[PDB]
Amino acid sequence: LKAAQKTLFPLRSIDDVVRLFAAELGREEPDLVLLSLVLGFVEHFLAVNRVGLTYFPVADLSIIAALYARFTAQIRGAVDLSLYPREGGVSSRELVKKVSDVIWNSLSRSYFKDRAHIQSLFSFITGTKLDSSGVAFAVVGACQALGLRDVHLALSEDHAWVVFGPNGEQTAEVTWHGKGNEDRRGQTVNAGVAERSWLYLKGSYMRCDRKMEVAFMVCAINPSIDLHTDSLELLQLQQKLLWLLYDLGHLERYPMALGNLADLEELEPTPGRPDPLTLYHKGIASAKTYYRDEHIYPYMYLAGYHCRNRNVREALQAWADTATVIQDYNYCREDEEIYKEFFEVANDVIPNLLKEAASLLEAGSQGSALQDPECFAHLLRFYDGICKWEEGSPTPVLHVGWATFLVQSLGRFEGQVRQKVRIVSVPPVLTFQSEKMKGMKELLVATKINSSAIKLQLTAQSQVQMK
Ligand SMILES: CNc1nc(NC2CCN(Cc3ccc4c(cc(C#N)n4C[C@H](C)N4CCN(S(C)(=O)=O)CC4)c3C)CC2)c2cc(CC(F)(F)F)sc2n1
């Protein structure tokens, strides 16, 4: 560490950690290794082991500098730069692979790879454990420590890798995804881009600078103590650090970070700040501006907020927007995480919401989503996008389990409401993009819902029971 990096120690409070991040973010290049070690230290003593806690776990320079020295020694010792000449101030694929191998080979042979609190360089050093995206971050921090200014973190909505090389144009896989089913470690991401999978976002993934890599580690803070309890101290630290990054402009290209900040503000609003809704909409605006509106989670963040607040109209609208994004992807083998999200929304969340709305309608609610044809249109647009998604995909999406819930959900709206939606062809008003929903149009607006016909149309089940 440089002398100027050490003057704020010891860190005795949340605000002292914020000052450290402010100082680093004002430097030429913030020190990723220093910052991740500090966050992991304070997370360990606020969420993993709170024995002896009286206010805040004091981070002494001697402790942090020793951890820092362990990391930099491990990397500099195992990676000999002389073997990998750098032509052009840029790194080679072999060098990036070597750094990835060094991180990988340091990890415990067996552990639960989905645990909490294994995201930081603190976990790497003290526990020899990292989660999937934690390995990618560690590769980037190791590269920074080695002076490899061109190596940066790349992020989709469910995976992480690195960019590097001439113009920062090369990609390399450096960690596992999911079960570790495939690998492609060391290869480009271009096959996944070319297949139009959600996992690689059609190439509209995040290419971090150093400041966005700091935002990533802040988003990566895990306040959870257990399944029922969060650390207030860590929630506050994450919130204050996210506001710092926001004010400095470093969340401009980070949609999900804005959703995280909005969620924190909902829990505990900061005087004189934008409201959660404004922040969710900035997240969506970031995705439209920088990522061709090809991201799903900005709309999911918004929908969840509306769901929690029982704004059924606005929740349905946001979900219909999630589907309007997914429809221009192919559903591929490693996209299971976003299938799980759509599944739970269609087959659990929406049914719960509409069941409650039905009871409230019985009790005399006015302005009910169930009496609003625009709400029925949103529901139909949601299913349309899912059906369009499935078109031309190498693996199907829909099955009869989905059909039971679609029929139930349609039935929550009376015929007099459903009949008000106008479904218009290309070449409330809605246009369907999917052939499935186009074929379902007359069934949707009929006084009595034909369940079996709907099932057949949604699943493209050819035949009905013989006997
Ligand atoms: C913040 N930075 C960041 N975050 C990353 N990933 C985040 C993606 C969002 N999740 C939280 C999450 C999960 C599911 C969500 C939602 C929202 C919805 C909806 N509807 N849904 C659907 C589900 C079914 N329900 C709906 C009902 N609600 S409720 C009870 O509240 O009403 C709960 C959630 C959210 C917000 C947290 C993690 C990532 C990932 C990266 C790639 C890599 F590899 F690094 F991991 S970078 C990154 N950055």
Swiss-Prot record:
Essential component of a MLL/SET1 histone methyltransferase (HMT) complex, a complex that specifically methylates 'Lys-4' of histone H3 (H3K4). Functions as a transcriptional regulator. Binds to the TERT promoter and represses telomerase expression. Plays a role in TGFB1-mediated inhibition of cell-proliferation, possibly regulating SMAD3 transcriptional activity. Represses JUND-mediated transcriptional activation on AP1 sites, as well as that mediated by NFKB subunit RELA. Positively regulates HOXC8 and HOXC6 gene expression. Changing E233K: Found in isolated hyperparathyroidism; likely pathogenic. Changing C219F: In MEN1; loss of interaction with KMT2A and JUND. GO terms for biological process: DNA damage response; DNA repair; MAPK cascade; negative regulation of cell cycle; negative regulation of cell population proliferation; negative regulation of cyclin-dependent protein serine/threonine kinase activity; negative regulation of DNA-binding transcription factor activity; negative regulation of DNA-templated transcription. The keyword Cell division does not apply. Coiled coil: none annotated. It is linked to Familial multiple endocrine neoplasia type I: Autosomal dominant disorder characterized by tumors of the parathyroid glands, gastro-intestinal endocrine tissue, the anterior pituitary and other tissues. Cutaneous lesions and nervous-tissue tumors can exist. Prognosis in MEN1 patients is related to hormonal hypersecretion by tumors, such as hypergastrinemia causing severe peptic ulcer disease (Zollinger-Ellison syndrome, ZES), primary hyperparathyroidism, and acute forms of hyperinsulinemia. MEN1 inactivating mutations are responsible for hyperfunctioning of the parathyroid glands and subsequent primary hyperparathyroidism. Primary hyperparathyroidism can occur in isolation or in association with multiple endocrine neoplasia. One of its GO terms (cellular component) is cleavage furrow. This is Menin.
